[PDB]
Homo-oligomer: A and B are copies of this chain.
């Protein structure tokens, strides 16, 4: 009776609140993945810029060294790391998809 009506009301409430939180969680992890993508892009681009600067400086120094060795009678280690978050972002995508699969559809 009224215990059953109250139990059904509570079931509906739990379902609504859980689905709302589920949408919120989906959104949060999707934004986290997009932010990780942008972070990877920025970090890798700045690492490429640093490597390009080092290589350009080395090339110019070599050219100057050739010019100097011409007036004489002579013959003639920076490590940049690239960021790789591909697998982690794929796992995050699968997490978001499981959250998709976790929607609650009550029997009326």
Contacts and interface: CB of A to CB of B under 8 A. Distances in A.
A51 to B, nearest CB: 9
Given A7-B7, A50-B50, A98-B20, A42 B43 contact: yes
Interface residues on A, range: 35 or more
Count identical subunits in the complex.
3
Given A20-B101, A95-B25, A80 B49 contact: yes
Q: Chain A interface mostly helix, strand, loop or mixed?
A: helix
Interface of A: 3-4, 6-11, 13-15, 17-18, 20-25, 27-29, 31-32, 34-36, 38-43, 45-47, 49-50, 52-54, 56-57, 77-85, 88-89, 91-92, 94-96, 98-99, 101-104, 106-108
